[PDB]
Amino acid sequence: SNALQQWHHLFEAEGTKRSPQAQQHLQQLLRTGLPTRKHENWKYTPLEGLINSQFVSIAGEISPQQRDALALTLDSVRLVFVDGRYVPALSDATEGSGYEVSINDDRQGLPDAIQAEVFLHLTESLAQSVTHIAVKRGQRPAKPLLLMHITQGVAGEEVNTAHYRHHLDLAEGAEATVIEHFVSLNDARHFTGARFTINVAANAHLQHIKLAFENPLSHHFAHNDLLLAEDATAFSHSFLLGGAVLRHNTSTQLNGENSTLRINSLAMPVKNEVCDTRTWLEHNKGFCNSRQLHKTIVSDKGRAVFNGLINVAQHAIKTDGQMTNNNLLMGKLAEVDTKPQLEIYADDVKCSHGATVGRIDDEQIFYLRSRGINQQDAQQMIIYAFAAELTEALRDEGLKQQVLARIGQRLPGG
Template identity: 55%
Template sequence: MTGLLPDNDLLVQFSQLFQQRTSLSNMQAHWQQYHWKETIKLGFSNHKHEDWKYTSLDRLLQYRFNYAQKLKISKQQCDCLALPLDSHRLVFLNGRFIASLSDNIYESYQVSSLVEQKNIPVAVHAEVFLHLTESLAQESLLIRLAAGKKSNKPLYLLHISSGQTDNQNKNIINSSYYRHHLLIEENAKIQVIEHFVSLNNQSHFTCARLTISLGDNAQLTHYKLAFENQHSYHFSHNDLILGNHAYAHSDSFLLGANLTRHHTSAQLNGKGSYISINSLLLPFREEICDSRTYLEHNKGHCHSQQLHKTIVYNNGKAVFDGILKVAPHAVRTDGKITNNNLLLSKQAEVNTKPRLEIYTDDVKCSHGATVGYIDIEQVSYLRSRGISKTKAKQMIIFAFAAELTESLKNKIIHQQVVTRITKRLKRIDI
């Protein structure tokens, strides 16, 4: 158990929450007990552990963790936080599904409580916060899109988390746990939007777990928007499991939170499948943003692409860790991981580690990373055209991000991402 935090303080705190949880069934309680044992086994590591070398959990030790209480907010409050989308909206507040704020009709989707785990895939690449979320989630949701169905509207999952409003107890932090499973059957097509926001400007702790199973020839377009406040803590883990000739595209925009650690794990378990995994990170000042991917090519003739970009300012820190693994019989695999990083100041820090594990011949795989500063010659050229220094740098930053933002086919998502980046850039002096 080397490399754990002193006395494993976090484990003691979360143990108290585990005793307070409510389970929907004996089967769910058994499943949560399993995940809690795995949480105990792994523990919460300090910087001496390789996986946590660049992402310190020390700042969490200042808090005492509570389950966020059930709250009621008005539809008007909810609408102000929501994206103006023509969608099927499901609203979650402090870890719980709020039917009164959600749409009543889901078109082709079937929505129910996730009480049986027998059809849920095991974790692709487990880690401690994955197990923590599974063990502490008060509710779990199953969303099914039947075979051959193609929804005309995106599925919009709005997660609203709130911080403590009692200023007398600043060391107490609300914690919320979100658990969803999407079952996309063969020949079905879906667009999914995960949106995380803060109800107020107080500190809060969010854990989220989303698993998605795609049947043969199924198609998924997925956007994750982590737009919580700068005092929040966001830990999440998404799993994507693809069948034969399935297609998945996943974009994550991690544009908020004091400390973020997001995992995307995937398995290509059918022939001829394609997956694209991308992310954009903007940690400023003392923020830490950690993005990790783990991708298994388990069948032949599959294609994967990954593009991960970070923009880091002041004492901000970005971490990227990506693994592309090719199984012995996964011939004709075509896989690529790229991580590009832009530093806006000398104090900014980025740690990048893309890597390959290949156990067969007849593949085409590559990985690479770049780290650099804003090109002064580009700034000078723009200034010679009458553009201010600040505006010139902003234009270069947006150009750097454009490879991800301009590929967004949903115009509302594109607008919201660009607006979020603009607001964050206004907070800093570049």
């Protein structure tokens, strides 16, 4: 493969002091190695492009003008990261924002991974620093925390790679909204990886939004963790639009009773792209309700891959959980591979999933065209309607509109 050794050399690279945690992760990364297409969980997601490449870690630098050119228009507390590196000059003062933020490589308090896989390990080892985010007890910050990631490629066939690591602690009774934004500086391809671990304490409310907006040629491999205590609420919305190959994991544990969890994602592969969206949920305590809505819209030889698993622990009674995956295939060469999965160790529970694969209604299209609306505009009205349930959960209208634009760029228009 050669890829593991390159990543290893990046690990041991010049003048970099690495935490014990990162080394521990590196070694299990090296122990399990890279998966093949005959692995249970790798059948539909191609590694061929990524594992034969020459990798470099090159931290470049950018101007404020470039940043704001790529930035969301939002009123927020915005931390800016470039090529795996925190950039104070481009960031906002966090004091008095409600967010206690510290960027450094001390990992001593970081929680263990819920489900361990090769790329989680890679990101853990190659992450240059950790963002420690804490919201104190009972606090409900006025502005959302925005974490903007600007990653760039390098000239040549070299793939510049960057790995980001964040941890957010919502203290008991805290309520906060946090957004991940991922963009490319330019059209040069790059390899991104990201891990965001979030701890939600008793009576804490989390809203997490992930926007992976990077360029058509790059690789985005991410694994997020949500830990919920009792009486806790967590919502996570991921809109994965960008990258040549994107694989996102959200692993959640419900470790306390009477907690609410909702996890959504939107995938929209165009042009040879592969979009892999995966979830791992464990109900380890009873009386928790969970809901999942995962929608894919596949165009143009694109491949959407859905994987999700609800594990109901023994004795976790009065569990209520549901998973829905709706897939729309508009390309004749388009493909969707979906595997909703239940593992249920308790009898007194309600757990269900459903998954659909469907087409564009030709009759609707024709009806719209017959009144003068162009075929493409029509198809866009219908598609937008199909994703509307997901985009409508964004409460900020200004943000929602930008997301809808990003969606629009991948439609048969613009």
